[PDB]
Scaffold this motif. Sequence first.
Motif, PDB file in Angstrom:
ATOM      1  N   UNK A  46       0.732  43.561  30.214  1.00 53.39           N
ATOM      2  CA  UNK A  46       1.315  42.183  29.345  1.00 53.39           C
ATOM      3  C   UNK A  46       2.634  41.868  29.654  1.00 53.39           C
ATOM      4  N   UNK A  47       2.898  40.628  29.472  1.00 54.09           N
ATOM      5  CA  UNK A  47       4.163  40.178  29.486  1.00 54.09           C
ATOM      6  C   UNK A  47       5.086  40.895  28.466  1.00 54.09           C
ATOM      7  N   UNK A  48       6.535  40.903  28.740  1.00 50.83           N
ATOM      8  CA  UNK A  48       7.394  41.414  27.591  1.00 50.83           C
ATOM      9  C   UNK A  48       7.261  40.537  26.277  1.00 50.83           C
ATOM     10  N   UNK A  49       7.103  41.192  25.257  1.00 55.40           N
ATOM     11  CA  UNK A  49       7.067  40.772  23.890  1.00 55.40           C
ATOM     12  C   UNK A  49       8.541  40.498  23.425  1.00 55.40           C
ATOM     13  N   UNK A  50       8.607  39.771  22.513  1.00 55.83           N
ATOM     14  CA  UNK A  50       9.785  39.254  21.669  1.00 55.83           C
ATOM     15  C   UNK A  50      10.475  40.646  21.012  1.00 55.83           C
ATOM     16  N   UNK A  51      11.937  40.528  21.028  1.00 56.94           N
ATOM     17  CA  UNK A  51      12.523  41.769  20.268  1.00 56.94           C
ATOM     18  C   UNK A  51      12.256  41.957  18.804  1.00 56.94           C
ATOM     19  N   UNK A  52      11.743  40.956  18.192  1.00 61.43           N
ATOM     20  CA  UNK A  52      11.354  41.558  16.658  1.00 61.43           C
ATOM     21  C   UNK A  52       9.996  42.149  16.417  1.00 61.43           C
ATOM     22  N   UNK A  53       9.189  42.178  17.573  1.00 67.40           N
ATOM     23  CA  UNK A  53       7.911  42.660  17.400  1.00 67.40           C
ATOM     24  C   UNK A  53       7.583  44.305  17.267  1.00 67.40           C
ATOM     25  N   UNK A  54       8.306  44.917  18.229  1.00 67.79           N
ATOM     26  CA  UNK A  54       8.235  46.574  17.838  1.00 67.79           C
ATOM     27  C   UNK A  54       8.655  46.771  16.534  1.00 67.79           C
ATOM     28  N   UNK A  59       1.678  55.059  17.240  1.00 70.50           N
ATOM     29  CA  UNK A  59       0.918  54.180  18.604  1.00 70.50           C
ATOM     30  C   UNK A  59       0.849  52.937  17.790  1.00 70.50           C
ATOM     31  N   UNK A  60       1.460  52.032  18.532  1.00 69.66           N
ATOM     32  CA  UNK A  60       1.662  50.768  17.782  1.00 69.66           C
ATOM     33  C   UNK A  60       0.657  49.889  18.683  1.00 69.66           C
ATOM     34  N   UNK A  61      -0.468  49.087  18.269  1.00 71.86           N
ATOM     35  CA  UNK A  61      -1.243  48.335  18.858  1.00 71.86           C
ATOM     36  C   UNK A  61      -1.308  46.936  17.992  1.00 71.86           C
ATOM     37  N   UNK A  62      -2.106  45.904  18.758  1.00 72.42           N
ATOM     38  CA  UNK A  62      -2.829  44.987  18.160  1.00 72.42           C
ATOM     39  C   UNK A  62      -4.000  44.663  18.926  1.00 72.42           C
ATOM     40  N   UNK A  63      -4.955  44.304  17.933  1.00 74.42           N
ATOM     41  CA  UNK A  63      -6.482  44.056  18.382  1.00 74.42           C
ATOM     42  C   UNK A  63      -6.693  42.436  18.017  1.00 74.42           C
TER      43      UNK A  63
END
Length: 212
Positions: free
Chosen positions: A16-24, A198-202
């Motif tokens: 995956x690409x890096x995700x924005x800082x507010x996501x986690x 464990x943080x995911x997105x489906x």
Amino acid sequence: GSHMPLGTEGFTVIDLPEVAPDILPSYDRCPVDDYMGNGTRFKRFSQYKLTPAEDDTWSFKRLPHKKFNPVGGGIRRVYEPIEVDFTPLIAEGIRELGLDRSEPWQINVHQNRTRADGGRPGPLTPEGVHHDGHEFVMIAILNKVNVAGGTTRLWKPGADAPFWSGTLEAGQAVLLDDRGLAHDVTDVLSADGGPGHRDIVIIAFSRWAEKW
């Protein structure tokens, strides 16, 4: 085929690409899932209609959040909307799937956190092996803190054992033919007896006309 989006076997694993800082941090504000997981899952949900547009772009639109005895129908769960932007990850799925442009698509996005702890595993597929009911499913692992388990397993329909197994880490996603392949996932486990998650997105893909 080897050149096809899902390869020879109906799945592929990508970085995956890096995700924005507010996501986690947004995972910290996901309410508990009251329908499943005995207090270990926290979840938000949003849906999008994806329409082929000018050039080779996709337009999207986020969807809005009986007087007799029915003979048929459905019972659905109700979750709060997602508060951040996962459309970059949808974009990754669109490219990798070579998503067919002949018609619009429904995109379902589940932002899921599973917490584990000493003596309290986090179940992911308590129902066992199943199909999600979509054409394509993307499972993106965004964060793992102090956990083990969470091994994704793909099964041929009618098979007694998975033909593929893999413990995806943060920054990886698996995309799968959700029709030809079934799946399940082993429980999330505390890595050292202490709290963990464990943080995911489906991200699920189905042709719009098939669901509406």
